[PDB]
Symmetry: D2
Subunit: 123 residues, 4 copies
């Protein structure tokens, strides 16, 4: 079976994301939903856009996407691979770069954070 990006996902920090159909070029869009208090009610939703690599039509493709945050001046990109895990579940293993806005090119060196996220299906 193929690991497919389309559907609803949640990650190891409680964020959720929904990705729509992936077209013939590999392109998808979706929404990324995050709480703005850890274990609390305030929820904000931002669009994401990206692609799945379709070379050799792998059953476990790599992909990447950009989340265009609507509640700050930052941007995050995620890249990873859609696996069928050893337990037979679909999992997206991703790493990300979070770019903050700085005012002066002299502060550019501290504007990028890095981390991972693992997503599994919300069914």
């Amino acid at each position: 079976r193929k690991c497919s990006l389309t559907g609803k996902w949640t990650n190891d920090l409680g964020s959720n994301m929904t990705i729509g159909a992936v077209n013939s070029k590999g392109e998808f869009t979706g929404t990324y939903t995050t709480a703005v208090t850890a274990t609390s009610n305030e929820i904000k939703e931002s669009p994401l856009h990206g692609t799945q690599n379709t070379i050799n039509k792998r059953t476990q493709p790599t992909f990447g996407f950009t989340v265009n945050w609507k509640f700050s001046e930052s941007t995050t990109v995620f890249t990873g691979q859609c696996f069928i895990d050893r337990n037979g579940k679909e999992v997206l293993k991703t790493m990300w770069l979070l770019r903050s806005s700085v005012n002066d090119i002299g502060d550019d060196w501290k504007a990028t954070r890095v981390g991972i996220n693992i997503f599994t299906r919300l069914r």
Copy 2:
């Protein structure tokens, strides 16, 4: 006067990219012609897709994009900020993650490279 992603850029490793118009949502597409590759595969031009953050209509906005490589199974994402020094020169300062495809989730841990690229506008 605002740093705009539209147009033609080159980086410190000799790669080029072109980016078309940015829509009012911040979305753009482009093409990336890479000078370097991790595979021994023949390189080719590959599409990219991304967004520029439009919050507070910054003069120097953050942005990100995904390069959907067409000559391998990998994906790279870039993110950075468009800077504009006063005389008027624009620079894109970016960082990227290059994701390779691995056959087994056991190898996932070594599938992600990181680095930087600085882009400047392709000379007239």
Copy 3:
């Protein structure tokens, strides 16, 4: 009651490391026995050397260390923080860069992998 790096740890990929006493400068040495490698080389135990930040004598201090691999030409650095949940469990949350050796500076751009590891105390 403070999160201390001294002792024996294991990570989410099955690797182990031992770390000896932390001196009053924050310096420690250890050994790292890796479960995984990017090369197809036979793994072996490798020394590590690092420091824990002693500013404000934090209960949960940041730290970093370098693993000087003995079965390849690579180096990996880890950095992270020692957390201690109230019942008393310690966790090291780290990120690392794995540097491969390349023969030509032209290839430097693809020589650095990044990822995470979470370590917990090796079970009695």
Copy 4:
């Protein structure tokens, strides 16, 4: 000729570092000097400790080091390779991870920044 870590270096942001002799195990110590105003007088000096890989005694070894900052609770690690550049000069091409202290394990996801530094000899 060998690229050797020992000596004084400066980087693309104006920081300086001095690394002592590298012993038979690959170990070195040194000092990392940084300004706490960009283009200004206030200078702070922190120790660094690390190793150079000595497998196959390469003329261009990889290495890594940790800077134990003495003016904050953060730590940085650098890793890279000592090259003889195409112009015949020694250059250290490095990337680093800067770990900030957070109070709550729930904020751990944003505590790591990433960037590069290129060092050349101050002679």
